[PDB]
Design a protein around this ligand. Structure first.
Ligand SMILES: CC[C@@H](Nc1ncnc2[nH]ccc12)C(C)(C)O
Length: 167
């Protein structure tokens, strides 16, 4: 039993809700919140900009030190950093950004990072400003993640389409 509330159950392990991931994280304080990151951990917009803003830029400060030490992530890769005031940990996961021409096949690799954590609050990877089809992202999530994932989402109209089209 966990403290996630109001989710629709899609499969044995995948749950979904129309919600602002920032507000959800602040309420639940999950062990792991997933950020929709880029390889430079430059948290400008979408989920990343919103999460970072909610940390008063502490996420960005920590991220800049991470990059200075380690260099950029890989597309499809991840790193674990602090969750600041939002969660114990933040799993920064880089899905392919179609608006940069990146290979959508890497979306499965991106979701595989979730399997290293027993429970996660997460957005749909590569959705929104990353330019992929969210119906496809949800399908890849369900077919790749085996741990317990609570998907937040932002767009109410999109949420209804995802539920109604889910197979
Ligand atoms: C990852 C794409 C997604 N964006 C978000 N989802 C959940 N919480 C959010 N908070 C700020 C942005 C955001 C959407 C489906 C709306 O395009």
């Amino acid at each position: 039993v966990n403290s996630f509330s109001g989710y629709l159950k899609l499969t044995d392990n995948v749950y979904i809700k129309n919600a602002d991931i920032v507000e959800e994280a602040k309420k639940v304080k999950p062990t792991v919140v997933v950020n929709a990151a880029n390889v430079y951990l430059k948290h400008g917009g979408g989920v990343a900009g919103a999460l970072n803003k909610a940390t008063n830029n502490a996420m960005q400060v920590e991220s800049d030190d991470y990059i200075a030490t380690n260099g950029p992530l890989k597309v499809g890769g991840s790193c674990v950093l602090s969750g600041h005031n939002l969660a114990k940990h933040c799993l920064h996961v880089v899905g392919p950004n179609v608006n940069k021409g990146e290979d959508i096949q890497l979306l499965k690799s991106a979701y595989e990072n979730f399997n290293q954590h027993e429970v996660l609050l997460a957005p749909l990877l590569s959705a929104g400003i990353f330019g992929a089809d969210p119906i496809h992202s949800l399908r890849v999530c369900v077919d790749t993640v085996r741990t317990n994932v609570y998907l937040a989402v932002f767009d109410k109209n999109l949420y209804d389409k995802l539920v109604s089209s889910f197979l």
